[PDB]
Design a binder for this molecule. Structure first.
Ligand SMILES: Cc1ccc(OCC(=O)N2CCOCC2)c(C)c1
Ligand SMILES: [Zn+2]
Length: 140
């Protein structure tokens, strides 16, 4: 689990969005596994705008922050499960790191701020959904 709280906005994995997220929907994309919803109180995170390929991500299934190198946002895919079983993936950055399905929502952070949240992974790969192209998150 996990969210980015940026202004009065909440960024979550689309597949973990709550009824309240859908009922207070700002924006969603199944091909990014991203969903953004409204908050009443302002949030304590800031968003990176950058092309950093180094950062640190939170891995709930090790209670550890790991420093990683990660790919630039691209089109990628997977192999059978049960909620989305395999799937492709627009704007998936990959790194070598331990990630299980429930590791989704952990933040990836570089020197410019929040980069993304854990979205996919497998066989010692962790995939992050980029939020760095989403400039509209900072204003309005
Ligand atoms: C962060 C993260 C997200 C998804 C993921 O795998 C779970 C899943 O989607 N499956 C598809 C591939 O086959 C295994 C089951 C993993 C390993 C990590
Ligand atoms: Zn950066």
């Amino acid at each position: 689990s996990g969210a980015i709280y940026v202004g009065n906005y909440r960024v979550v994995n689309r597949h973990l969005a709550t009824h309240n997220d859908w009922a207070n929907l700002v924006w969603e994309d199944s091909s990014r596994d991203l969903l953004v919803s409204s908050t009443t109180a302002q949030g304590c995170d800031t968003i990176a705008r950058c092309d950093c390929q180094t950062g640190v991500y939170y891995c709930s299934s090790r209670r550890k922050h790991y420093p990683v190198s990660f790919s630039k946002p691209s089109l990628i895919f997977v192999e059978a499960s049960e909620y989305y079983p395999a799937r492709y993936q627009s704007h998936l950055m990959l790194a070598v790191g331990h990630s299980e399905p429930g590791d989704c929502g952990g933040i990836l952070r570089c020197q410019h701020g929040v980069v993304g949240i854990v979205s996919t992974g497998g066989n010692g790969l962790v995939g992050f959904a980029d939020v760095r192209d989403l400039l509209w998150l900072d204003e309005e």
